[PDB]
Amino acid sequence: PFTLPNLPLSSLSNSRAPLPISSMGISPDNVQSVQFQNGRCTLDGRLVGTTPVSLSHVAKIRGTSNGTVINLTELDGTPFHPFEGPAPIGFPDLGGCDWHINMTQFGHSQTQYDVDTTPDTFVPHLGSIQANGIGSGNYVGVLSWISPPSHPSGSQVDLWKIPNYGSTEATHLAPSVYPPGFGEVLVFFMSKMPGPGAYNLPCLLPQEYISHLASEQAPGEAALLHYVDPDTGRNLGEFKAYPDGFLTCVPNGAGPQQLPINGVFVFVSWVSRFYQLKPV
């Protein structure tokens, strides 16, 4: 029988960053569809985009700086070529912001790497990004803290966005995720990302939800889920999981931000895609 981890969201991690999930949320009105590259997984077990199985590959980078540019490899160190994807597996998919990643080495005793994902020099899709000061050597890097994007100009952090991966155009992005509609809204798992702001990082799935799905490769139009409270067992609400790997729910007016996070999504049964959900 289909399953989801019998684990509170409050003890799970974001899938776009190695961060504990602090809550659920809904996207703003100027956010229609979403095209996150990490944290993409079908209920089939199929990983999508640059999404890795483990939280340990999430939002990291590997490569060698020649002093002016950094050529990328898989976290593994094995070659990465354009045809494979928009960037190496686990590559940071946070758009609308500047990056500051901790760079360390194997065999050498760290260096902040300030990344502006805006110039023509940021071409992770061709395995090469600006080595903005990072000296020569091979490095391991993890996103640590973000800041406003330096060029949209005077712009604020917008994590619903994806960074520009090429230019060069056909980077092979995973498809966009659209709300099924009929009042249903996309559910996002939020996490607090360090930086001089009140940054909330959404994602369609908790990192462990993906490993469980990838493993529990069980072969349904839509999954009717119950957000249940562990100890009492009371059904805190109804939800629907879709094949492409995301959850919906109908807000009980102008939703999920109101529910506690120590709850667990339980698979009740498979249902019709147009199954009218009870307000939350």
PDB file of C-alpha atoms in Angstrom:
ATOM      1  CA  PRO A   1       0.000   0.000   0.000  1.00  0.00           C
ATOM      2  CA  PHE A   2       1.202   3.510  -0.835  1.00  0.00           C
ATOM      3  CA  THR A   3       2.884   5.306   2.069  1.00  0.00           C
ATOM      4  CA  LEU A   4       4.471   8.547   3.247  1.00  0.00           C
ATOM      5  CA  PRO A   5       6.948   8.765   6.123  1.00  0.00           C
ATOM      6  CA  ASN A   6       5.243   8.390   9.505  1.00  0.00           C
ATOM      7  CA  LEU A   7       7.280  11.423  10.607  1.00  0.00           C
ATOM      8  CA  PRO A   8       6.224  14.916  11.827  1.00  0.00           C
ATOM      9  CA  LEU A   9       7.109  17.653   9.329  1.00  0.00           C
ATOM     10  CA  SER A  10       8.743  19.497  12.230  1.00  0.00           C
ATOM     11  CA  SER A  11      11.476  16.860  12.297  1.00  0.00           C
ATOM     12  CA  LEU A  12      11.952  16.796   8.530  1.00  0.00           C
ATOM     13  CA  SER A  13      14.146  18.856   6.237  1.00  0.00           C
ATOM     14  CA  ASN A  14      13.612  21.267   3.353  1.00  0.00           C
ATOM     15  CA  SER A  15      14.576  19.893  -0.072  1.00  0.00           C
ATOM     16  CA  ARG A  16      16.122  23.058  -1.497  1.00  0.00           C
ATOM     17  CA  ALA A  17      18.403  23.536   1.495  1.00  0.00           C
ATOM     18  CA  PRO A  18      19.566  21.389   4.401  1.00  0.00           C
ATOM     19  CA  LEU A  19      17.161  23.124   6.789  1.00  0.00           C
ATOM     20  CA  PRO A  20      14.574  21.905   9.292  1.00  0.00           C
ATOM     21  CA  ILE A  21      11.037  22.578   8.064  1.00  0.00           C
ATOM     22  CA  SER A  22       9.502  25.330  10.203  1.00  0.00           C
ATOM     23  CA  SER A  23       6.025  25.318   8.636  1.00  0.00           C
ATOM     24  CA  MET A  24       3.672  24.867   5.703  1.00  0.00           C
ATOM     25  CA  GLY A  25       2.607  27.746   3.521  1.00  0.00           C
ATOM     26  CA  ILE A  26       0.912  29.035   0.405  1.00  0.00           C
ATOM     27  CA  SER A  27       2.427  31.041  -2.456  1.00  0.00           C
ATOM     28  CA  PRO A  28       1.684  34.770  -2.968  1.00  0.00           C
ATOM     29  CA  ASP A  29      -0.786  35.954  -5.618  1.00  0.00           C
ATOM     30  CA  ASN A  30       1.969  36.833  -8.073  1.00  0.00           C
ATOM     31  CA  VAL A  31       3.074  33.196  -7.942  1.00  0.00           C
ATOM     32  CA  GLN A  32       1.076  30.926 -10.230  1.00  0.00           C
ATOM     33  CA  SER A  33       3.171  27.934 -11.189  1.00  0.00           C
ATOM     34  CA  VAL A  34       6.452  26.735  -9.702  1.00  0.00           C
ATOM     35  CA  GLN A  35       9.501  25.110 -11.324  1.00  0.00           C
ATOM     36  CA  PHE A  36      11.871  24.095  -8.525  1.00  0.00           C
ATOM     37  CA  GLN A  37      14.698  21.839  -9.713  1.00  0.00           C
ATOM     38  CA  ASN A  38      15.522  20.321  -6.327  1.00  0.00           C
ATOM     39  CA  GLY A  39      12.900  18.616  -4.187  1.00  0.00           C
ATOM     40  CA  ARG A  40      11.241  17.182  -7.262  1.00  0.00           C
ATOM     41  CA  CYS A  41       9.999  13.631  -6.989  1.00  0.00           C
ATOM     42  CA  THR A  42       7.090  11.677  -8.414  1.00  0.00           C
ATOM     43  CA  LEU A  43       5.039   9.514  -6.043  1.00  0.00           C
ATOM     44  CA  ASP A  44       6.526   6.891  -8.370  1.00  0.00           C
ATOM     45  CA  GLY A  45       9.986   7.299  -6.919  1.00  0.00           C
ATOM     46  CA  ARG A  46      11.352   9.116  -9.990  1.00  0.00           C
ATOM     47  CA  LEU A  47      13.684  11.969  -9.060  1.00  0.00           C
ATOM     48  CA  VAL A  48      13.353  15.108 -11.181  1.00  0.00           C
ATOM     49  CA  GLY A  49      15.520  18.097 -12.078  1.00  0.00           C
ATOM     50  CA  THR A  50      18.769  18.212 -10.120  1.00  0.00           C
ATOM     51  CA  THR A  51      17.143  16.538  -7.106  1.00  0.00           C
ATOM     52  CA  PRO A  52      19.370  14.028  -5.248  1.00  0.00           C
ATOM     53  CA  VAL A  53      18.155  11.209  -2.986  1.00  0.00           C
ATOM     54  CA  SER A  54      19.971  12.410   0.159  1.00  0.00           C
ATOM     55  CA  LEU A  55      19.963  15.767   1.996  1.00  0.00           C
ATOM     56  CA  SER A  56      23.778  15.497   1.915  1.00  0.00           C
ATOM     57  CA  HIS A  57      23.931  16.346  -1.817  1.00  0.00           C
ATOM     58  CA  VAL A  58      21.412  19.212  -1.548  1.00  0.00           C
ATOM     59  CA  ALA A  59      22.515  22.804  -2.334  1.00  0.00           C
ATOM     60  CA  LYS A  60      26.201  21.919  -2.753  1.00  0.00           C
ATOM     61  CA  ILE A  61      28.789  22.413  -5.496  1.00  0.00           C
ATOM     62  CA  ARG A  62      32.067  20.806  -6.519  1.00  0.00           C
ATOM     63  CA  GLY A  63      34.677  22.078  -8.919  1.00  0.00           C
ATOM     64  CA  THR A  64      38.107  23.481  -9.658  1.00  0.00           C
ATOM     65  CA  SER A  65      38.881  27.191  -9.842  1.00  0.00           C
ATOM     66  CA  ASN A  66      41.463  28.377 -12.369  1.00  0.00           C
ATOM     67  CA  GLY A  67      41.459  31.720 -10.613  1.00  0.00           C
ATOM     68  CA  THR A  68      38.857  33.248 -12.899  1.00  0.00           C
ATOM     69  CA  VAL A  69      36.202  30.564 -13.448  1.00  0.00           C
ATOM     70  CA  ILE A  70      35.013  27.387 -11.718  1.00  0.00           C
ATOM     71  CA  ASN A  71      34.388  24.268 -13.771  1.00  0.00           C
ATOM     72  CA  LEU A  72      31.814  21.970 -12.212  1.00  0.00           C
ATOM     73  CA  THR A  73      31.653  18.226 -11.633  1.00  0.00           C
ATOM     74  CA  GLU A  74      29.059  16.154  -9.808  1.00  0.00           C
ATOM     75  CA  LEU A  75      29.379  16.368  -6.000  1.00  0.00           C
ATOM     76  CA  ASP A  76      31.051  13.020  -6.728  1.00  0.00           C
ATOM     77  CA  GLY A  77      33.843  14.624  -8.714  1.00  0.00           C
ATOM     78  CA  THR A  78      32.791  12.704 -11.795  1.00  0.00           C
ATOM     79  CA  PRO A  79      32.349  14.738 -15.021  1.00  0.00           C
ATOM     80  CA  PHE A  80      29.206  16.753 -15.666  1.00  0.00           C
ATOM     81  CA  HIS A  81      28.116  17.487 -19.246  1.00  0.00           C
ATOM     82  CA  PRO A  82      25.357  19.820 -20.587  1.00  0.00           C
ATOM     83  CA  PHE A  83      23.096  17.033 -21.870  1.00  0.00           C
ATOM     84  CA  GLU A  84      22.634  15.707 -18.340  1.00  0.00           C
ATOM     85  CA  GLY A  85      20.736  18.691 -16.968  1.00  0.00           C
ATOM     86  CA  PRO A  86      20.509  22.396 -15.987  1.00  0.00           C
ATOM     87  CA  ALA A  87      23.415  21.806 -13.593  1.00  0.00           C
ATOM     88  CA  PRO A  88      25.078  19.018 -11.567  1.00  0.00           C
ATOM     89  CA  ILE A  89      22.944  17.070  -9.104  1.00  0.00           C
ATOM     90  CA  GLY A  90      22.274  18.954  -5.878  1.00  0.00           C
ATOM     91  CA  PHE A  91      23.224  22.296  -7.373  1.00  0.00           C
ATOM     92  CA  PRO A  92      21.514  25.242  -5.552  1.00  0.00           C
ATOM     93  CA  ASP A  93      18.158  26.010  -7.181  1.00  0.00           C
ATOM     94  CA  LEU A  94      17.341  29.169  -5.232  1.00  0.00           C
ATOM     95  CA  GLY A  95      16.645  31.981  -7.659  1.00  0.00           C
ATOM     96  CA  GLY A  96      16.013  35.623  -6.784  1.00  0.00           C
ATOM     97  CA  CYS A  97      19.067  36.109  -4.556  1.00  0.00           C
ATOM     98  CA  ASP A  98      22.849  36.218  -4.217  1.00  0.00           C
ATOM     99  CA  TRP A  99      24.641  33.227  -2.760  1.00  0.00           C
ATOM    100  CA  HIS A 100      27.299  32.855  -0.088  1.00  0.00           C
ATOM    101  CA  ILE A 101      28.549  29.300   0.089  1.00  0.00           C
ATOM    102  CA  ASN A 102      31.123  27.777   2.407  1.00  0.00           C
ATOM    103  CA  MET A 103      33.981  26.336   0.344  1.00  0.00           C
ATOM    104  CA  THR A 104      36.270  23.741   1.871  1.00  0.00           C
ATOM    105  CA  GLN A 105      38.765  21.194   0.567  1.00  0.00           C
ATOM    106  CA  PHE A 106      39.872  17.588   0.894  1.00  0.00           C
ATOM    107  CA  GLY A 107      43.427  17.782   2.165  1.00  0.00           C
ATOM    108  CA  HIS A 108      43.539  21.463   3.034  1.00  0.00           C
ATOM    109  CA  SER A 109      42.486  23.263   6.167  1.00  0.00           C
ATOM    110  CA  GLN A 110      37.153  27.496   4.466  1.00  0.00           C
ATOM    111  CA  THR A 111      36.208  30.297   2.079  1.00  0.00           C
ATOM    112  CA  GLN A 112      32.986  32.241   1.588  1.00  0.00           C
ATOM    113  CA  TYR A 113      32.013  32.243  -2.073  1.00  0.00           C
ATOM    114  CA  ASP A 114      29.797  35.162  -3.042  1.00  0.00           C
ATOM    115  CA  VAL A 115      27.722  34.175  -6.048  1.00  0.00           C
ATOM    116  CA  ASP A 116      25.718  36.530  -8.255  1.00  0.00           C
ATOM    117  CA  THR A 117      23.711  34.106 -10.400  1.00  0.00           C
ATOM    118  CA  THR A 118      22.918  36.893 -12.857  1.00  0.00           C
ATOM    119  CA  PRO A 119      25.841  37.556 -15.252  1.00  0.00           C
ATOM    120  CA  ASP A 120      26.501  35.705 -18.481  1.00  0.00           C
ATOM    121  CA  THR A 121      29.366  34.170 -16.493  1.00  0.00           C
ATOM    122  CA  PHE A 122      26.970  32.139 -14.344  1.00  0.00           C
ATOM    123  CA  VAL A 123      26.503  29.237 -16.740  1.00  0.00           C
ATOM    124  CA  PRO A 124      26.206  26.158 -14.518  1.00  0.00           C
ATOM    125  CA  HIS A 125      24.405  24.443 -17.367  1.00  0.00           C
ATOM    126  CA  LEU A 126      27.741  24.325 -19.219  1.00  0.00           C
ATOM    127  CA  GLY A 127      29.540  23.458 -15.982  1.00  0.00           C
ATOM    128  CA  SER A 128      31.238  26.823 -15.477  1.00  0.00           C
ATOM    129  CA  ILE A 129      30.526  29.697 -13.073  1.00  0.00           C
ATOM    130  CA  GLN A 130      32.434  32.865 -12.185  1.00  0.00           C
ATOM    131  CA  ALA A 131      35.251  32.256  -9.739  1.00  0.00           C
ATOM    132  CA  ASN A 132      34.616  35.630  -8.113  1.00  0.00           C
ATOM    133  CA  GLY A 133      37.880  35.584  -6.171  1.00  0.00           C
ATOM    134  CA  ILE A 134      38.033  31.891  -5.262  1.00  0.00           C
ATOM    135  CA  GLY A 135      41.669  30.961  -5.741  1.00  0.00           C
ATOM    136  CA  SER A 136      42.875  27.942  -7.707  1.00  0.00           C
ATOM    137  CA  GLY A 137      42.141  24.530  -6.251  1.00  0.00           C
ATOM    138  CA  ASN A 138      39.390  21.955  -5.994  1.00  0.00           C
ATOM    139  CA  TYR A 139      36.564  22.857  -3.659  1.00  0.00           C
ATOM    140  CA  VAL A 140      33.492  21.486  -1.904  1.00  0.00           C
ATOM    141  CA  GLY A 141      30.766  24.045  -1.253  1.00  0.00           C
ATOM    142  CA  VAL A 142      27.453  24.333   0.572  1.00  0.00           C
ATOM    143  CA  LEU A 143      25.024  27.244   0.535  1.00  0.00           C
ATOM    144  CA  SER A 144      25.217  28.833   3.981  1.00  0.00           C
ATOM    145  CA  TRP A 145      23.428  32.168   3.852  1.00  0.00           C
ATOM    146  CA  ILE A 146      21.775  34.341   1.228  1.00  0.00           C
ATOM    147  CA  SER A 147      21.239  38.036   0.586  1.00  0.00           C
ATOM    148  CA  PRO A 148      19.181  40.119  -1.838  1.00  0.00           C
ATOM    149  CA  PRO A 149      19.951  39.495  -5.541  1.00  0.00           C
ATOM    150  CA  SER A 150      22.543  42.049  -6.622  1.00  0.00           C
ATOM    151  CA  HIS A 151      21.149  42.939 -10.042  1.00  0.00           C
ATOM    152  CA  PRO A 152      17.440  42.872 -10.513  1.00  0.00           C
ATOM    153  CA  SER A 153      18.353  46.105  -8.611  1.00  0.00           C
ATOM    154  CA  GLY A 154      17.030  47.191  -5.236  1.00  0.00           C
ATOM    155  CA  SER A 155      15.154  43.930  -5.420  1.00  0.00           C
ATOM    156  CA  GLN A 156      14.307  41.813  -2.416  1.00  0.00           C
ATOM    157  CA  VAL A 157      14.756  38.058  -1.950  1.00  0.00           C
ATOM    158  CA  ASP A 158      12.299  36.010  -4.042  1.00  0.00           C
ATOM    159  CA  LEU A 159      12.780  32.285  -3.431  1.00  0.00           C
ATOM    160  CA  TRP A 160       9.844  31.200  -5.550  1.00  0.00           C
ATOM    161  CA  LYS A 161      12.201  31.855  -8.423  1.00  0.00           C
ATOM    162  CA  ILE A 162      14.804  29.650 -10.051  1.00  0.00           C
ATOM    163  CA  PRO A 163      18.268  30.958 -11.025  1.00  0.00           C
ATOM    164  CA  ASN A 164      19.181  31.488 -14.653  1.00  0.00           C
ATOM    165  CA  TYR A 165      21.195  28.354 -15.544  1.00  0.00           C
ATOM    166  CA  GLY A 166      22.411  29.188 -19.053  1.00  0.00           C
ATOM    167  CA  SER A 167      23.549  31.950 -21.407  1.00  0.00           C
ATOM    168  CA  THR A 168      22.680  28.416 -23.484  1.00  0.00           C
ATOM    169  CA  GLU A 169      18.864  28.341 -23.530  1.00  0.00           C
ATOM    170  CA  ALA A 170      17.769  24.692 -23.613  1.00  0.00           C
ATOM    171  CA  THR A 171      19.083  23.824 -20.168  1.00  0.00           C
ATOM    172  CA  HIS A 172      16.662  20.897 -19.817  1.00  0.00           C
ATOM    173  CA  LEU A 173      14.729  22.206 -16.813  1.00  0.00           C
ATOM    174  CA  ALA A 174      12.187  20.015 -15.090  1.00  0.00           C
ATOM    175  CA  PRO A 175       8.632  21.118 -16.066  1.00  0.00           C
ATOM    176  CA  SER A 176       6.716  23.752 -14.125  1.00  0.00           C
ATOM    177  CA  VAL A 177       4.288  22.749 -11.389  1.00  0.00           C
ATOM    178  CA  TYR A 178       0.818  24.249 -11.725  1.00  0.00           C
ATOM    179  CA  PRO A 179      -1.986  24.360  -9.152  1.00  0.00           C
ATOM    180  CA  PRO A 180      -4.717  21.887 -10.220  1.00  0.00           C
ATOM    181  CA  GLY A 181      -7.238  24.632  -9.508  1.00  0.00           C
ATOM    182  CA  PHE A 182     -10.865  24.456  -8.459  1.00  0.00           C
ATOM    183  CA  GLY A 183      -9.913  26.234  -5.254  1.00  0.00           C
ATOM    184  CA  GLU A 184      -7.055  23.800  -4.689  1.00  0.00           C
ATOM    185  CA  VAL A 185      -3.737  25.469  -3.886  1.00  0.00           C
ATOM    186  CA  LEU A 186      -0.123  24.254  -3.927  1.00  0.00           C
ATOM    187  CA  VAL A 187       1.250  23.348  -0.490  1.00  0.00           C
ATOM    188  CA  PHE A 188       4.796  24.396   0.385  1.00  0.00           C
ATOM    189  CA  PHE A 189       7.068  23.328   3.204  1.00  0.00           C
ATOM    190  CA  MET A 190       8.849  26.395   4.603  1.00  0.00           C
ATOM    191  CA  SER A 191      12.256  26.679   6.295  1.00  0.00           C
ATOM    192  CA  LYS A 192      14.164  29.618   7.767  1.00  0.00           C
ATOM    193  CA  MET A 193      17.254  30.423   5.717  1.00  0.00           C
ATOM    194  CA  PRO A 194      20.082  32.422   7.371  1.00  0.00           C
ATOM    195  CA  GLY A 195      20.820  35.856   5.939  1.00  0.00           C
ATOM    196  CA  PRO A 196      20.098  39.498   6.851  1.00  0.00           C
ATOM    197  CA  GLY A 197      16.383  38.945   6.264  1.00  0.00           C
ATOM    198  CA  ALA A 198      13.314  36.969   7.368  1.00  0.00           C
ATOM    199  CA  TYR A 199      13.869  34.475   4.518  1.00  0.00           C
ATOM    200  CA  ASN A 200      11.377  31.599   4.149  1.00  0.00           C
ATOM    201  CA  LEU A 201      12.443  28.819   1.770  1.00  0.00           C
ATOM    202  CA  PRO A 202       9.527  26.878   0.282  1.00  0.00           C
ATOM    203  CA  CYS A 203       9.781  23.468  -1.370  1.00  0.00           C
ATOM    204  CA  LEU A 204       7.261  20.975  -2.678  1.00  0.00           C
ATOM    205  CA  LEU A 205       8.634  18.143  -0.555  1.00  0.00           C
ATOM    206  CA  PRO A 206      10.523  17.471   2.691  1.00  0.00           C
ATOM    207  CA  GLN A 207      13.886  15.898   1.837  1.00  0.00           C
ATOM    208  CA  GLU A 208      13.007  12.639   3.591  1.00  0.00           C
ATOM    209  CA  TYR A 209       9.689  12.415   1.769  1.00  0.00           C
ATOM    210  CA  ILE A 210      11.734  12.055  -1.417  1.00  0.00           C
ATOM    211  CA  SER A 211      14.118   9.385  -0.161  1.00  0.00           C
ATOM    212  CA  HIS A 212      11.151   7.337   1.080  1.00  0.00           C
ATOM    213  CA  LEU A 213       9.378   7.708  -2.269  1.00  0.00           C
ATOM    214  CA  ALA A 214      12.553   6.983  -4.259  1.00  0.00           C
ATOM    215  CA  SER A 215      13.054   3.853  -2.164  1.00  0.00           C
ATOM    216  CA  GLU A 216       9.451   2.783  -1.674  1.00  0.00           C
ATOM    217  CA  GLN A 217       9.074   2.835  -5.493  1.00  0.00           C
ATOM    218  CA  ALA A 218       5.461   1.636  -5.240  1.00  0.00           C
ATOM    219  CA  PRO A 219       3.585   2.069  -8.578  1.00  0.00           C
ATOM    220  CA  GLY A 220      -3.398   6.430  -8.813  1.00  0.00           C
ATOM    221  CA  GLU A 221      -4.961   9.660 -10.066  1.00  0.00           C
ATOM    222  CA  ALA A 222      -4.483  11.472  -6.769  1.00  0.00           C
ATOM    223  CA  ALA A 223      -3.723  10.580  -3.162  1.00  0.00           C
ATOM    224  CA  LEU A 224      -6.205  11.631  -0.488  1.00  0.00           C
ATOM    225  CA  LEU A 225      -4.115  12.541   2.530  1.00  0.00           C
ATOM    226  CA  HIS A 226      -5.024  13.305   6.125  1.00  0.00           C
ATOM    227  CA  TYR A 227      -2.897  15.667   8.156  1.00  0.00           C
ATOM    228  CA  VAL A 228      -3.036  13.819  11.460  1.00  0.00           C
ATOM    229  CA  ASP A 229      -1.776  14.699  14.935  1.00  0.00           C
ATOM    230  CA  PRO A 230       0.367  11.825  16.282  1.00  0.00           C
ATOM    231  CA  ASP A 231      -0.751  11.487  19.938  1.00  0.00           C
ATOM    232  CA  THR A 232      -4.483  12.270  19.611  1.00  0.00           C
ATOM    233  CA  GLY A 233      -4.910  10.968  16.087  1.00  0.00           C
ATOM    234  CA  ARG A 234      -7.387  13.710  15.223  1.00  0.00           C
ATOM    235  CA  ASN A 235      -7.474  14.468  11.515  1.00  0.00           C
ATOM    236  CA  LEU A 236      -6.239  18.052  11.367  1.00  0.00           C
ATOM    237  CA  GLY A 237      -7.326  18.254   7.743  1.00  0.00           C
ATOM    238  CA  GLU A 238      -7.681  16.887   4.218  1.00  0.00           C
ATOM    239  CA  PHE A 239      -5.107  17.080   1.414  1.00  0.00           C
ATOM    240  CA  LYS A 240      -4.364  15.617  -2.001  1.00  0.00           C
ATOM    241  CA  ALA A 241      -1.023  14.396  -3.312  1.00  0.00           C
ATOM    242  CA  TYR A 242      -0.439  14.375  -7.080  1.00  0.00           C
ATOM    243  CA  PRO A 243       1.653  11.990  -9.286  1.00  0.00           C
ATOM    244  CA  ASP A 244       4.082  14.763 -10.243  1.00  0.00           C
ATOM    245  CA  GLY A 245       5.061  15.060  -6.600  1.00  0.00           C
ATOM    246  CA  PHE A 246       3.310  17.862  -4.734  1.00  0.00           C
ATOM    247  CA  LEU A 247       0.398  18.490  -2.391  1.00  0.00           C
ATOM    248  CA  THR A 248      -2.672  20.668  -2.690  1.00  0.00           C
ATOM    249  CA  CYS A 249      -5.402  21.715  -0.300  1.00  0.00           C
ATOM    250  CA  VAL A 250      -8.231  24.207  -0.341  1.00  0.00           C
ATOM    251  CA  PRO A 251      -7.711  27.069   2.129  1.00  0.00           C
ATOM    252  CA  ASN A 252     -10.749  27.676   4.334  1.00  0.00           C
ATOM    253  CA  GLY A 253     -10.784  31.228   3.018  1.00  0.00           C
ATOM    254  CA  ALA A 254      -8.169  33.982   2.812  1.00  0.00           C
ATOM    255  CA  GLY A 255      -4.898  28.040   5.026  1.00  0.00           C
ATOM    256  CA  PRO A 256      -2.077  25.611   6.091  1.00  0.00           C
ATOM    257  CA  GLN A 257      -0.001  28.319   7.802  1.00  0.00           C
ATOM    258  CA  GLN A 258      -2.640  27.895  10.525  1.00  0.00           C
ATOM    259  CA  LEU A 259      -1.860  24.220  11.175  1.00  0.00           C
ATOM    260  CA  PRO A 260       0.849  23.079  13.597  1.00  0.00           C
ATOM    261  CA  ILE A 261       3.914  21.347  12.107  1.00  0.00           C
ATOM    262  CA  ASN A 262       4.168  18.449  14.548  1.00  0.00           C
ATOM    263  CA  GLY A 263       1.640  16.635  12.368  1.00  0.00           C
ATOM    264  CA  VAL A 264       1.903  13.723   9.937  1.00  0.00           C
ATOM    265  CA  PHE A 265       0.478  13.180   6.455  1.00  0.00           C
ATOM    266  CA  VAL A 266      -1.206   9.796   6.272  1.00  0.00           C
ATOM    267  CA  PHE A 267      -2.210   8.111   3.033  1.00  0.00           C
ATOM    268  CA  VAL A 268      -5.949   7.431   3.306  1.00  0.00           C
ATOM    269  CA  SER A 269      -6.636   6.268  -0.262  1.00  0.00           C
ATOM    270  CA  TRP A 270      -6.349   6.894  -3.993  1.00  0.00           C
ATOM    271  CA  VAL A 271      -9.063   9.114  -5.471  1.00  0.00           C
ATOM    272  CA  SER A 272     -10.210  11.050  -8.538  1.00  0.00           C
ATOM    273  CA  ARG A 273      -8.104  14.022  -9.621  1.00  0.00           C
ATOM    274  CA  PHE A 274     -11.141  16.293  -9.196  1.00  0.00           C
ATOM    275  CA  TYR A 275     -11.887  15.066  -5.677  1.00  0.00           C
ATOM    276  CA  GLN A 276     -13.429  18.104  -3.960  1.00  0.00           C
ATOM    277  CA  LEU A 277     -11.417  18.671  -0.771  1.00  0.00           C
ATOM    278  CA  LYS A 278     -12.858  19.953   2.502  1.00  0.00           C
ATOM    279  CA  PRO A 279     -11.641  23.486   3.420  1.00  0.00           C
ATOM    280  CA  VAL A 280      -8.554  23.859   5.629  1.00  0.00           C
TER     281      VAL A 280
END
